[PDB]
Write a protein that binds this ligand. Structure first.
Ligand SMILES: [Mg+2]
Ligand SMILES: [Mg+2]
Ligand SMILES: [Mg+2]
Ligand SMILES: [Mg+2]
Ligand SMILES: [Mg+2]
Ligand SMILES: [Mg+2]
Ligand SMILES: [Mg+2]
Ligand SMILES: [Mg+2]
Ligand SMILES: [Mg+2]
Ligand SMILES: [Mg+2]
Ligand SMILES: [Mg+2]
Ligand SMILES: [Mg+2]
Ligand SMILES: [Mg+2]
Ligand SMILES: [Mg+2]
Ligand SMILES: [Mg+2]
Ligand SMILES: [Mg+2]
Ligand SMILES: [Mg+2]
Ligand SMILES: [Mg+2]
Ligand SMILES: [Mg+2]
Ligand SMILES: [Mg+2]
Ligand SMILES: [Mg+2]
Ligand SMILES: [Mg+2]
Ligand SMILES: [Mg+2]
Ligand SMILES: [Mg+2]
Ligand SMILES: [Mg+2]
Ligand SMILES: [Mg+2]
Ligand SMILES: [Mg+2]
Ligand SMILES: [Mg+2]
Ligand SMILES: [Mg+2]
Lengths: 138, 131
RNA sequence: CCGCGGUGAAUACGUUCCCGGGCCUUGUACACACCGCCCGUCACGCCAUGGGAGCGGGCUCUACCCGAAGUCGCCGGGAGCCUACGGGCAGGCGCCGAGGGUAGGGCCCGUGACUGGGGCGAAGUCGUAACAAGGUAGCUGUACCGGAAGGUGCGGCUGGAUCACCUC
RNA sequence: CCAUGUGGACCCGCCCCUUGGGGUGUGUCCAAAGGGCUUUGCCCGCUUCCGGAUGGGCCCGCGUCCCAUCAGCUAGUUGGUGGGGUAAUGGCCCACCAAGGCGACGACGGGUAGCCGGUCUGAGAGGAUGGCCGGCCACAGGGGCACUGAGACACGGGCCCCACUCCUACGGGAGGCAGCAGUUAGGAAUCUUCCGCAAUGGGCGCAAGCCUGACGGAGCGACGCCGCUUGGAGGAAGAAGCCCUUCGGGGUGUAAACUCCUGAACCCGGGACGAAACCCCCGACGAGGGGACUGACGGUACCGGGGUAAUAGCGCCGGCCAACUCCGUGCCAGCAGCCGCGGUAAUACGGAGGGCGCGAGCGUUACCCGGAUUCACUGGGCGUAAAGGGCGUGUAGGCGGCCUGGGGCGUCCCAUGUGAAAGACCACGGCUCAACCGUGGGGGAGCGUGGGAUACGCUCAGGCUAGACGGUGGGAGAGGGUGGUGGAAUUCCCGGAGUAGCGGUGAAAUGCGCAGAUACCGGGAGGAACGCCGAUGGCGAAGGCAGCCACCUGGUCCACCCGUGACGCUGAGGCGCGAAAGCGUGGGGAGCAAACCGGAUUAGAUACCCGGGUAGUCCACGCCCUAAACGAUGCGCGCUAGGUCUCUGGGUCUCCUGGGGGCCGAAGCUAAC
């Protein structure tokens, strides 16, 4: 039994990418599905599409990387070099609007969860709201 | 530790331990010398080093090193203790200031002075600049 | 001593042991490096501390009696003052009350005969426990005997070496 | 005291409100003083009542250190009714009734501490602190108490007790500086027994004005901060001196000398802002206008003239930390923040020269923050470095899968009230600058009220099955407990047979043997463990668990998808389990074996070796609870290459899928291993 539904996903994407898999599956759910909507509009992952496996819903996240490199260790740079969880369970981290994070000096987002859908540091600030700081990706 | 641990039974702040048992803070002490012996050094170094017990105003009978090339302290002299430990003398952790009370500054010294209480010289003994 | 030459042997299975050395490997708590280290002991000194018969001082709870000031409550009467007699004042008694005394229990401040071991500090003492299979593998909980070191018992551990016991 | 009553107070009936708010009815109760002048006028005052103003009481949410080696506190204590008391609620006080109230979301106790605006530090988060100024509290010799009053339970008021010094014909009285100033004690340490009432302010008065160490100021202290000076230009390939110099010269150094220019101190003359009204006059006693007195600081600041070159020190110069030679000294004398430096070449001791730093100051000591991501929220850890609780069960608590809908507590947003002043930031301005001060401006977390959102968390309802649990059927196992049987071996006893030695050791000896041992055969008693299988294996939460058999019992894995429907993971405290040893009662006691008895080795052996031997090892019940109780690595869950060997279930079965044990290894990790 999972303890933190999201964190699970984030990680499942994290390791997934470290071994360069083409895409990984993760338990479906509105939220996660809305959380991946961002990683997708933002370029960290080609995309996700509702899929079934054994009979239970899952989400196929098609990871995105870069080009192969020159010299030793030719593996492709990472698109999601880092993807942490901020607001863990039993640690709820909600930030005001003036408390929203800047994240990797604009090189990365920070998915918030404001009472106005799931937005990113940008949007959320643009709309003028704050809320549970779900994660930080770069 | 879990943050819900840090919550119940938080973090213990770091208490300090004064390496200078000179009551009520106080920067200097007034004590009455008692025995002015000559303790030896320690592991690496060697010689004879002037030192002297001091019945402190606060009530403590603490040892004190006697700086300088030579001094005039005896068995009843009143003295001022500063503070600072010597590393070749276990037990003492305080210094004796000079040119203060029965404690007189060493003669002829010429650089230290402020340290080693010792009114500089007169140099040819004229105004602030002649010689 | 340096050198010359004349005559001219014996023996060597074999590397285990003795002295010196080369390579490889393992252990190491050693690295002016085993003509090493470290632990413990007895002796001289210094700093602090635990216990601690007994005493002194202040503070608190408890039981019972003693209880100032003062406010509240009762009286305030042919014997006190005032009274248009409605009543007021003095005074009296009482509950409460500072504090005090009696016996007992705990708290800390302080003095202290008697006692324990501690840490450190020059040069010394005796043993050799540990460190390399450290010459009885080591450690460990426990029990016992020993001034102490440590010795042996019982079970565990490897944080044990050595092609007995076979991960590097 | 009576009268009076716009009115107001109370009871009581009623209305509008809604806990003693407002309005009303008949009844009852309650006022008061005068003084003064330019006296038919007005000033002051006075009484009652409603309102404003200000100030304050009370109450509540929230926030406020350390120690659980402080864990239980509480009897007026928790509530209730009646009553007392107060301006008002109330255990605030008393009487009765009930028995409760507070506590691990730390009560009770000990220790420490006035709290805040702010200050210091810090990148921030945070830490440390709360002296000056401002707001709040509390105290005034210790303790208690009330009187008077709007207000006090009254610092320079009062009463009693205590201590204390003081007067006393001893019968009894008097005081309190934690007010300014001073004294003494303490101490490393903290000032003038000043001037002024001119100003701002407070008190009383129609006013004149009185009072006021509040305050405005001056003095002392480099205690801190800020500005100022000791001079400015010139002045030789370069004085003297002192230093160094494999001795030619380098250095102090343009530094001085010397020249010229300026001219703090000091002298002369002038000297003020801070001061305008209260009073008096006109006016109307308004508004307004006119008049006049009014300084502590001061003869000070400041301006004008003249005017002399006219205080410097202190720390360091091995590395951190910027600054190097020589002479002395010789593990001495001495340095030292850490590391250390000195035992006859010291850049680390002392002096000299030189140099760096800072400059009326510089060093030092103490303490706070920093560095210290060394208590880590931001920002750490636990295989071997300090760190996983011996294991489990489970309480409080923390945490919680999937879908939809209500709430919308959290959470976010907008408005608004609050967030005084000083300080802080910013702009502007004043004192010749600054320090310091004035004006304006900005922001603020939090908290209150109103409105809004609803993703995520909380709550509620409805629904699902991907967690979990159950069911069906199957498997392995030294899992445990109870009872019972089995063989080997050992020692002891009996019989037979049989001798002279056996045993033991590096060698030996003690020890056992002719009451005939050992060695061999047969039979008997007893205790303990249980070969080979057996393993590089298994099972158990750990400890731990192996002859076989039966029985009672735990857990667990798989196949089926059948049932419930999130029912879950963790787990402070509690409770239970927990090798060996040890302890208690009782039994048993073959072998072994602490202590102990001898033997031998040794320089000596209370030791390694040897021969005996007690507790003990054994079982029963009770106790102990520790451990290298080790994988030295908490539990659960999800995710991330493989290969190889192995145990156990399913399988289209030497291939794939589940559970468990080892090996080697991707990525990754690690200080390395
Ligand atoms: Mg002192
Ligand atoms: Mg001098
Ligand atoms: Mg001079
Ligand atoms: Mg040894
Ligand atoms: Mg083996
Ligand atoms: Mg009525
Ligand atoms: Mg009411
Ligand atoms: Mg910091
Ligand atoms: Mg007074
Ligand atoms: Mg006035
Ligand atoms: Mg007046
Ligand atoms: Mg200041
Ligand atoms: Mg001139
Ligand atoms: Mg810190
Ligand atoms: Mg650490
Ligand atoms: Mg949920
Ligand atoms: Mg809400
Ligand atoms: Mg303010
Ligand atoms: Mg439900
Ligand atoms: Mg079974
Ligand atoms: Mg559990
Ligand atoms: Mg036992
Ligand atoms: Mg027993
Ligand atoms: Mg026997
Ligand atoms: Mg460790
Ligand atoms: Mg099958
Ligand atoms: Mg496996
Ligand atoms: Mg490996
Ligand atoms: Mg690798």
């Amino acid at each position: 039994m999972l303890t933190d539904p999201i964190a699970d996903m984030l990680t499942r994407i994290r390791n997934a990418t470290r071994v360069y898999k083409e895409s990984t599956e993760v338990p479906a759910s509105r939220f996660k599905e809305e959380i991946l909507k961002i990683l997708a509009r933002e370029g960290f992952i080609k995309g996700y599409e509702r899929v079934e496996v054994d009979g239970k819903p899952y989400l196929r996240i098609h990871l995105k990387y870069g080009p192969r490199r020159q010299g030793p260790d030719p593996r492709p740079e990472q698109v999601i070099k880092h993807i942490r969880r901020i607001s863990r369970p039993g640690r709820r981290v909600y930030v005001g609007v003036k408390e929203i994070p800047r994240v990797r000096r604009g090189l990365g987002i920070a998915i918030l969860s404001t009472p106005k859908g799931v937005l990113t540091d940008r949007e959320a600030r643009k709309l003028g709201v704050g809320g549970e700081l779900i994660c930080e990706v770069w | 530790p879990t943050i819900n641990q840090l919550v119940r039974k938080g973090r213990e702040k770091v208490r300090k331990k004064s390496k200078v048992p000179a009551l009520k803070g106080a920067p200097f002490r007034r004590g009455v010398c008692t025995v002015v012996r000559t303790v030896t050094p320690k592991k690496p170094n060697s010689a004879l080093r002037k030192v002297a017990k001091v019945r402190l105003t606060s009530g403590y009978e603490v040892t004190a090193y006697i700086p300088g090339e030579g001094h005039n302290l005896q068995e009843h002299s009143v003295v001022l203790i500063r503070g600072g430990r010597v590393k070749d003398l276990p037990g003492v952790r305080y210094h004796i200031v000079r040119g203060v009370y029965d404690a007189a500054g060493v003669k002829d010294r010429k650089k230290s002075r402020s340290k080693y209480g010792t009114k500089k010289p007169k140099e040819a003994a004229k105004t602030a600049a002649k010689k």
